[PDB]
Amino acid sequence: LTTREIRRQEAIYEMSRGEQDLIEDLKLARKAYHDPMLKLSIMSEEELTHIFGDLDSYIPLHEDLLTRIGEATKPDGTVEQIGHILVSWLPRLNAYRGYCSNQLAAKALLDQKKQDPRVQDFLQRCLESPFSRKLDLWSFLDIPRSRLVKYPLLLKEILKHTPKEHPDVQLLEDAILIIQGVLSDIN
Amino acid sequence: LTTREIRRQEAIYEMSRGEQDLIEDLKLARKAYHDPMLKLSIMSEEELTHIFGDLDSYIPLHEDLLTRIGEATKPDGTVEQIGHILVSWLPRLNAYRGYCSNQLAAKALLDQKKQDPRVQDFLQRCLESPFSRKLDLWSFLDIPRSRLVKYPLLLKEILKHTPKEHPDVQLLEDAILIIQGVLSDIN
Numbered sequence: 001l002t003t004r005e006i007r008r009q010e011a012i013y014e015m016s017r018g019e020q021d022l023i024e025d026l027k028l029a030r031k032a033y034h035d036p037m038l039k040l041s042i043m044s045e046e047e048l049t050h051i052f053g054d055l056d057s058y059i060p061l062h063e064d065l066l067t068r069i070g071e072a073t074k075p076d077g078t079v080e081q082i083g084h085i086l087v088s089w090l091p092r093l094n095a096y097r098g099y100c101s102n103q104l105a106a107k108a109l110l111d112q113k114k115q116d117p118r119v120q121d122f123l124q125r126c127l128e129s130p131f132s133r134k135l136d137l138w139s140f141l142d143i144p145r146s147r148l149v150k151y152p153l154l155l156k157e158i159l160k161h162t163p164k165e166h167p168d169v170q171l172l173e174d175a176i177l178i179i180q181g182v183l184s185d186i187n
Numbered sequence: 188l189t190t191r192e193i194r195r196q197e198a199i200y201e202m203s204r205g206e207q208d209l210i211e212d213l214k215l216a217r218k219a220y221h222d223p224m225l226k227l228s229i230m231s232e233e234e235l236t237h238i239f240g241d242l243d244s245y246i247p248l249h250e251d252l253l254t255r256i257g258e259a260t261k262p263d264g265t266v267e268q269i270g271h272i273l274v275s276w277l278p279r280l281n282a283y284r285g286y287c288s289n290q291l292a293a294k295a296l297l298d299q300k301k302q303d304p305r306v307q308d309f310l311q312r313c314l315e316s317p318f319s320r321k322l323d324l325w326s327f328l329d330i331p332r333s334r335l336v337k338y339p340l341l342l343k344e345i346l347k348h349t350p351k352e353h354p355d356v357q358l359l360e361d362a363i364l365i366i367q368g369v370l371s372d373i374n
Contacts, residue, residue: 001316009318032262075219077318129188131196131264 001078008161009078012069015154019066022147023059028133029140030055032126042118050106051113051140053099058144065089082158083171090178093148100148100186106141114138148186151179188265195348196265199256202341206253209334210246215320216327217242219313229305237293238300238327240286245331252276269345270358277365280335287335287373293328301325335373338366 034052037043043051068085113119126132136142159172221239224230230238255272300306313319323329346359 006317013318036262075223075319076313076316077320078316126263129263129265130193131200132262133264 004161005163008158011154011158011161012079012082015158016066016069018147018150018154019062022143023062023066025135025143026055026059026062028135029143030059032133033135033137037119037122040122042116042122043113047109047113050102050109051137053144054095057095061092061095064092081166081168081171083168083175086155086175087171087178090151090175090182093151093179093182094185096144096148097186100141100145103141103145110138148183152176152183155179191348192350195345198341198345198348199266199269202345203253203256205334205337205341206249209330210249210253212322212330213242213246213249215322216330217246219320220322220324224306224309227309229303229309230300234296234300237289237296238324240331241282244282248279248282251279268353268355268358270355270362273342273362274358274365277338277362277369280338280366280369281372283331283335284373287328287332290328290332297325335370339363339370342366 029052034048034055038045038048065085068089069079069082072082072085073079123137127134155172155176159169159176162168162172216239221235221242225232225235252272255276256266256269259269259272260266310324314321342359342363346356346363349355349359
């Protein structure tokens with residue numbers, strides 16, 4: 001394996017580790033925050049979907065990417081082609097249209113809720129436990145946003161190390177265009 | 188939270204991390220070893236089930252434990268009761284009866300196959316890749332065996348830190364008896 005082709009694979013791995021991390025945080029937000037607050041009636045659903053969005057849709061969306069990459073990973077750990085997955089997956093990031101279309105309206109409830117004693121108490125409890133796992137609740141919207149805005153860099157890095165005569169060149173070039181379109185359809 | 192009750196939770200966590208690890212190795216054995224060798228006809232299925240057993244059954248068996256513990260884990264990360272899961276799960280370790288009933292017959296093929304050039308070549312390839320993940324193929328049977336023999340220690344450690352008047356005391360006491368029975372039904 002060449003030094004360059006090792007970077008190509010390292011670039012593909014860097015990306016999927018990013019997905020594992022997003023998924024861990026989306027699940028944590030669903031389990032430790034959203035569901036309990038909804039259950040204890042600390043916040044109404046209308047409110048909780050303003051803050052968190054459709055977690056129930058995003059989690060299997062990003063898991064789906066990770067599944068497909070894993071299935072394309074050989075026994076030796078390398079992945080030969082990836083463009084065909086990305087091109088046919090990226091358009092699904094259009095599932096964020098609604099959530100991210102009012103980041104403005106989101107940060108008006110957010111700032112309201114940080115005076116509520118019932119949320120303060122809920123967090124202080126969660127946080128007192130040495131087995132709890134923290135999320136910055138007040139800038140949650142940053143987690144997905146950060147990730148969505150990172151894809152073009154991740155894709156350009158895979159392409160930087162893709163051999164001239166490789167099918168991924170066209171597909172990755174076309175995927176960078178897909179990601180760029182999807183971004184404008186929410187900002 | 189008391190110093191003792193922190194140990195109880197640490198004991199429960201230690202156990203589930205063990206399951207995550209076993210699962211990672213059972214999946215790796217299925218993906219990097221069993222399936223490819225079966226596909227390339229380096230080994231017949233009869234042979235591969237002697238070496239690896241019914242991976243397809245063990246993986247969802249241990250995942251099932253991890254699912255159920257996760258569902259019993261509160262937002263704060265602690266788990267209040269665990270005996271009721273363990274008592275009703277442990278009898279399923281009886282799915283190892285067949286595999287482990289001929290550890291003797293297993294280590295006669297094993298020692299045969301380590302002279303086969305086709306297996307040597309297959310491994311040397313796998314291993315040459317910097318993205319590959321290693322398993323000691325020749326003492327694979329140790330991975331499950333080690334784990335099965337570790338449960339009684341894991342259970343006694345949870346019980347060591349369980350409060351006198353807690354429902355887990357009876358259940359864990361009864362689970363230790365279940366694990367002990369299951370072990371004799373294969374050794």
